[PDB]
Amino acid sequence: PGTAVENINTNVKALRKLIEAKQQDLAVKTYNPVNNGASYTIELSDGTSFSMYAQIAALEGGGEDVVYSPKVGAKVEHDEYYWTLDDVWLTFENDEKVKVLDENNTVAPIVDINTDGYWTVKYGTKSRTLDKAVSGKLTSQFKQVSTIGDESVSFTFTDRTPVIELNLFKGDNPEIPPVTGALRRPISPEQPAWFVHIDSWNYADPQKIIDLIPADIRPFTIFNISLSVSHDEATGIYNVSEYGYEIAKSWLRTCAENNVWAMVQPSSGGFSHFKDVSLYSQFESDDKVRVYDEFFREYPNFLGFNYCEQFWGYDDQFSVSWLQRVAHWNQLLKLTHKYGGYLVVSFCGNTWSANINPIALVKRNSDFAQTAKLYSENFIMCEKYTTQSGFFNVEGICLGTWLSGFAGQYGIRFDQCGWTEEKGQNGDKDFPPAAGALPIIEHVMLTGQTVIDGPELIWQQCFKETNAVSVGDGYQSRNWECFPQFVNINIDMFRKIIDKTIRIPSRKEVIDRTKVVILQDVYSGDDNAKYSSPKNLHEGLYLRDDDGNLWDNHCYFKKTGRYPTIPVAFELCDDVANSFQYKINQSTFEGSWSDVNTKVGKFNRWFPQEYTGELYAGRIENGWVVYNGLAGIRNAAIPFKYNTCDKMELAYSKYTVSVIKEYANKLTFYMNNYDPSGSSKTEVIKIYGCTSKPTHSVSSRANGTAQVSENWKEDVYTLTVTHNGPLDLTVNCSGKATDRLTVSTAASIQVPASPQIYQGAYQYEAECFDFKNVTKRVTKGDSEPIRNYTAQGYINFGASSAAAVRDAVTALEDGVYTIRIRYRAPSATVNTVDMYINNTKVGTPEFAQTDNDNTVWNTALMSVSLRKGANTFELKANSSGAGDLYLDNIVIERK
C-alpha cells in the first residue's frame, strides 16, 4: 500500500514537525525502524507519533530506473527555518522565501502530480509546476534516525537539510532491574512445556487465546507470539504482521499482565522482522536491534526468540544467508544465557537443505558450536513436520543435537502439512488429526522430548475466530474458539503428561535405552554425504515396507518399536554424551552397516524382541507406546514385563494410539483415536494367564465416547472397546509369574513456578475492545490506508451519538493511573466522548484535531483511580461527533 506521493508528503510533514519539536524543545520519547529501516515510527513527548520513510514507493507505471522527484527540505537563514526545493529556496511568485513555522498556517508544502503529468508543489493558495513526472524508482529526502551518546536523537536527510537533533526523553519512573542469571523457567521431564501460539494469522486478541488454555495447563504453557513473514515480494514489506515489533510488544505486555510465560517468533525462513547481528556488542550499542535486549530487560515473563523452519528463504534480497543467521544465533545465545532464556530453533528438511541442518549447524560453524556447548541449557532444537519427506533422518539428527550436548532440550513441532500431497498415507488423502497424536506421544515418551510446539497449522488445528458475540449491555466482541481436535487430542495428551501416565525420560535415560549413535565424521562428497544420515539407515529397522529411504521417506509412522530412534550427531561434547555404548562413525557406514541384513543382525543382538505383530509397540520401563499406523485392524502379541499375567494381545483400528502402563496386578490404557466427524472405532484387548476373574473400568475423557464389553472364557479376558476420542481404561488382572520387574516409585511432576510480577505498562488494542455503533473495525490493518498503528489494526470509533467501546483492564494495586488513548481525529476536535471507569463517568478526553496524514496518531491522557484487580474501561459518545475518531489502543501506567 501507500503511494510515492503519500510517502513524499509524509516526510515533508515530518520535517515541519521535527523543526517545531526543536523550537518547542519537545523530546523524542521513542523511535523504531521497520522493514530494515525502510521506515521509522517516531513518538514525541507530547504524544505525537508519525512515520518517516527512508525508502519511497515507486511511482506507478513500471519504470525501473531512478527518476527525479522534488526534494522539499529546510535550511536556516537569519535565525529561522525556511523551505527548500531541490536545495534552493522554495519560492512561488515573489522570489520570497517561505517560513517553516508561521503560526498562521499549519499546512506544509504539498507535493503532487497534476493532470498533465508534471510535479507540483503547493503552499497556501500558491502553486508552482516543476518537471515532468516519469514512472520509476524515487529517492527519499530523509536518510535515517539514530542515537548520539544517549542524550540525543539525530534526524539525517539526503539533501543538505542540516542534521536535526532532539533530546531523548529521560523517563521519570524508577528502573525495574531485569531477571538475570538462572533460567527464568526451567524445562525438564518434571516441567514439560507446551508452546501455544498467539498467532498473527488468527488476528488474535492475546487475552482471548490465553483464556482458552485451561487453568491446569496454563502454568506449563509458554505462549509463542508468532509474527508472520508474509510480505510483498518486490519491496520486502510485511503485510499480515505489518508491525512485528508492535505486535510482539503488545501481546507480550498482555502475557506479562496475565503472569504467563511467553516467547516471540520473528522468523520462519531466512525472513525475520528483526535485524540479524554479527557482534554481541550490538545488543546494547546498535539502535537498529534494540528489540532483543528490550524484551528480555522489560518483561520478566519473556523467555526468548523462536526461529522456526530454518530450512528455506535464505539469500533473498530481503533476508540473510544461513551463515549470517548462525552468526546471529551465536551472539543471541549469549544474550539469552545472560537473561536465563531459551533460543528455540526448529528444522524440517529436504535434499537441498542438508548443508543447513542441525549437523551442519555445528559442523560448519565452530564458533557457534563452542557457544552452543557452553550455553546448551539455553538452546532448544525441535524437529518440525512441515516438509514432505525425511522425517526419520531429521528426527534422528534433532535428537542427536540434544543427546550429544549441543542443545539442552529436545522438542516436537508437529504440522498437518507433512501429510503426503495428492495421495496421503494408507489411502487417506486428507490429513486425519488422529494421525498427529502418534509421533508426539512416541517421541515424547520414548525419546525424551520436553517441548511440544503447536501443533500446526495453528489456524486449522488449534484456534479460529468466529463472528462476534453479544457480551451484555448492547456490546458485541470478537470471539475465538478451540478446534475440537485441540481439546480432544492436544490438551488431553498434555494432561496425560501432567497426570504421570506419560513419563518423559531424561537425557541420560534416553542415552541408556538408545545404546547407539552415529557420528557424522564425513568431509568428502555431496552435502547429504556430509550432513545427512546414511541413506539406508532406517531400512529393515523401522522404515515401513511401502515407504523409501531418506528423501523418499514420506511417512512418519514406524513399522516396529523394537529399535529406538537412532540418533545422529556431529560430536559428543560431555561425559554424558560419551557414555553411549556404541559409537558408529558414518565414514565406516558404507563399509559395514550399509548391508541391511548385516545391520539388522547386529541391532537384533543389541535390542531383544519384546513383541510380535504389525502394530508399533515400544517399551520404556513399565510403559508401552502402541499404535496403528496402517490401514485395517492390526495386531500385537506382547509378553508382560511387570504384570504377573502372561501376555496381552491387541487389535487396534487405524490411527489408534495407546500408552499402556504395566503394574503387578493392574494395567492402564490411555487410548485415543479422535475424529471431529464422530466416527466410531473398535479395539480389542486380550489378557492371557489370569488366575482369577479380572475387572475393568473406563472413563471417557474430553468430548470422547466409549463403551466396553468384557468376556471371561477359558482363562482369557477380552475387552472390546468402542470409542471416538480419548479414554482411560483400567484393567485389574493378576497371575502367577514371579519373574517380573518391579515398578518404580511415582515419577515427579512439578507445576512450573509463575514469572516474576510485571511492574510495567499494560496495553489494550482498540480492535479488541467490545463495541457498539462504531463506523469500522480494522482487524487486518495492512490492506487499509492508515499506517503506524500498534498490533495488527485499530478501529474507527466514528461519530455516532450511540458509539461506545468497553474493555476489561487490570491493576496490580489501588491508586492513580495514567490512561494514554492513542487516537486520530483528522477533520475536527472531538469533545463528545466521555470515559467511564467501573460504570462511573471520570471525564471527557481532549481528542484534539490531528494532522490529516495517514501516519499520524496522537495520545490523550487521563488520570483515574483503579482498584486492585479487574476494572471496566468505557468510552461512550454523548452526542454526534464533530468528526471521526480513530482508536488504536490504550496504555495504562502507574502514576
Ligand X SMILES: OC[C@@H]1O[C@@H](O)[C@H](O)[C@H]1O
Ligand Y SMILES: O[C@@H]1[C@@H](O)[C@H](O[C@@H]2[C@@H](O)[C@H](O[C@@H]3CO[C@@H](O[C@@H]4CO[C@@H](O)[C@H](O)[C@H]4O)[C@H](O)[C@H]3O)OC[C@H]2O)OC[C@H]1O
**Contacts (CB under 6 A) with ligand Y, residues 321-350:** 350
Q: Which is nearer to ligand X, 417 or 842 (CB)?
A: 417
Q: Which is nearer to Ca ion, 198 or 382 (by Cβ)?
A: 198
Contact 182, 191 (CB under 8 A): no
CB of 419 to ligand Y, least distance (A): 14
Q: What is the dihedral of CA 534, 535, 540, 544, to 10 degrees?
A: 130
Which window, 30-38, 225-233, 640-648, 708-716, contacts ligand X (CB under 6 A)? 225-233
Residue closer to ligand Y by CB (options 386, 790) is 386
Long-range pairs for 216-219 at CB < 8 Å and ≥24 separation? 216/495, 216/498, 217/491, 217/494, 217/495, 217/498, 218/260, 219/751, 219/752, 219/754
Tell me the per-residue interface mask from 452 to 471 with ligand X, x by CB under 6 A, - otherwise: ----x---------------
- In the list 268, 365, 404, 622, the residue contacting ligand X (rule: CB under 6 A) is 268
Q: How many residues in the shown chain lie near ligand X by CB under 6 A?
A: 8
Site for ligand X contains 267 (CB under 6 A): no
Q: Is 309 in the site for ligand Y (CB under 6 A)?
A: yes
Closest CA to 138 of 32, 60, 216, 227: 60
| CA distances, 8 to each of 77, 135, 467, 734 (Å) | 24, 15, 39, 83
Residue type, 314: Y
Cβ atoms of 598 and 614 within 8 Å: the answer is: no
Q: Which of residues 227-246 bind ligand Y (CB under 6 A)?
A: 228-230
Binding region for ligand Y (CB under 6 A) out of 224-232, 250-258, 298-306, 457-465:
224-232
User: Taking CB within 5 to 8 Å according to partner kind, which of ligand X, ligand Y, Ca ion, none is near residue 308?
Assistant: ligand X
DSSP string, 206-239: HHHHHTTS-TTTGGGEEEEEEPP--B-TTT--BS
Q: What does the alpha-carbon distance between residue 407 and residue 203 come to, in Å, rounded to a whole number? A: 33
Report the nearest approach of ligand Y to the CB of residue 58 (Å): 23
Of 454 and 755, which has the nearer Cβ to ligand Y? 454
**CA distances to 201, 256, 688 from 192, in Å:** 26, 20, 36
Among 352, 473, 741, 870, interactor with ligand Y by CB under 6 A: 352
Closest contact distance (angstroms) between CB of 415 and ligand X is: 7
41 binds ligand Y per the rule CB under 6 A: no
Find the angle CA(737)-CA(743)-CA(746) to the nearest 5 degrees: 155
- Closer residue to ligand Y in complex, CB, 355/878: 355
C-alpha 23/C-alpha 573 separation (Å) is 61
Residue 96 burial (CB < 10 Å; 0-12/13-18/19+)? Answer: exposed
* Residue 268 near ligand Y by CB under 6 A: yes
Q: Which is nearer to ligand X, 11 or 267 (CB)?
A: 267
Query: Residue 78, Cβ neighbours under 10 Å: how many?
Result: 6
Segment near ligand X (CB under 6 A); pick from 2-10, 14-22, 165-173, 226-234: 226-234
Question: Which stretches of 689-782 are assigned E, i.e. beta strand?
Answer: 695-700, 705-713, 716-724, 727-732, 762-765, 770-772, 776-778
Kindly indicate which of the ranges 124-132, 226-234, 243-251, 395-403 contains the residues binding ligand Y, using the contact rule CB under 6 A: 226-234
Binds 352: which of ligand X, Ca ion, ligand Y, none (CB < 5-8 Å by kind):
ligand Y
Amino acid at position 557, single letter = F
What are the b/e assignments for 167-190, b being 16+ CB within 10 Å?
ebeeeeeeeeebbeeebbbbbbbe
Separation in Å, CA 327 to CA 290, 310, 768: 18, 14, 38
CB of 228 to ligand Y, least distance (A): 5
Q: In the complex, what is the shortest distance from the CB of residue 792 to Ca ion, in angstroms, rounded to a whole number? A: 7
CB of 456 to ligand X, least distance (A): 6
- Alpha helix (H) ranges present in 214-300? 244-257, 282-285, 290-298
Residue 688 CA from chain centroid, whole number: 49
Counting contacts by CB under 6 A, is residue 520 touching ligand X?
A: no
226 touches, from Ca ion, ligand X, ligand Y, none (C-beta below 5 to 8 Å by class): ligand X
Residue 57 touches which of ligand Y, Ca ion, ligand X, none (Cβ within 5-8 Å per kind) = none
* CB 701, min distance to ligand Y, A: 33
Q: Choose between 28 and 380: whose C-beta lies nearer to ligand X.
A: 380
Three-state DSSP state, 466:
coil
229 binds ligand X (CB under 6 A): yes
**CB-nearer residue toward ligand Y: 35 or 387:** 387
- Grid cell digits, residue 487: 481439546
Nearest distance from residue 415's CB to ligand Y, in Å?
A: 10
Give the position of cell 534480497: 317
Q: Which stretch binds ligand Y (CB under 6 A): 222-230, 436-444, 668-676, 885-893?
A: 222-230
**Interface with ligand X (CB under 6 A), residue from 9, 32, 207, 226:** 226
350 binds, among ligand Y, Ca ion, ligand X, none (CB under 5 to 8 A by kind): ligand Y
307 binds ligand Y (CB under 6 A): no
Tell me whether residue 309 or residue 395 sits nearer to ligand Y (CB atom). 309
Rg (CA), the chain: 31
Name the residue nearer to ligand X (CB basis): 456 or 683. Answer: 456
Q: Could you tell me the end-to-end alpha-carbon distance of the chain, in angstroms, rounded to an integer?
A: 39
Q: Which does 765 bind (CB under 5 to 8 A by kind): Ca ion, ligand Y, ligand X, none?
A: Ca ion
Instruction: Give the alpha-carbon dihedral of 181, 186, 188, 191, to 10 degrees.
Output: 170
Q: Which of 298, 309, 383, 492 binds ligand X (CB under 6 A)?
A: 309
Report the interface residues with Ca ion, using CB under 5 A: 765, 789-791, 794, 888-889
Q: Which one of ligand X, ligand Y, Ca ion, none is in contact with 794 (Cβ closer than 5 to 8 A by kind)?
A: Ca ion
Q: What angle do CA 602, 604, 610 make, to 5 degrees?
A: 160
Residues 6+ apart with CB under 8 A from 728: 501, 668, 669, 670, 698, 699, 701
Q: Measured over all CA atoms, what is the biggest interatomic distance in the chain, rounded to whole angstroms?
A: 114
User: For ligand Y, which is the closer residue by CB, 51 or 416?
Assistant: 416
Q: Which residue stretch of 128-136, 147-155, 162-170, 228-236 sits at the interface with ligand X (rule: CB under 6 A)?
A: 228-236
Task: Tell me the torsion sign for CA atoms 437, 441, 447, 449.
Answer: positive
Query: Binder to ligand Y among 31, 82, 312, 589 (CB under 6 A)?
Result: 312
- Least CB distance from residue 766 to ligand X, whole Å? 24
* Site residue total, ligand Y (CB under 6 A): 10
Select the residue interacting with ligand X from 45, 156, 230, 476 (CB under 6 A): 230
Residue type, 884: D
Sign of CA dihedral 763, 768, 773, 778: positive
Beta bridge partners of 168: 28
Q: Does 308 bind ligand X (CB under 6 A)?
A: yes
Q: Which is nearer to ligand X, 460 or 878 (CB)?
A: 460
Residue 3 grid coordinates? 503511494
Contact set with ligand Y (CB under 6 A)? 228-230, 268, 309, 312, 350, 352, 386-387
Contact set with ligand X (CB under 6 A)? 226, 228-230, 268, 308-309, 456
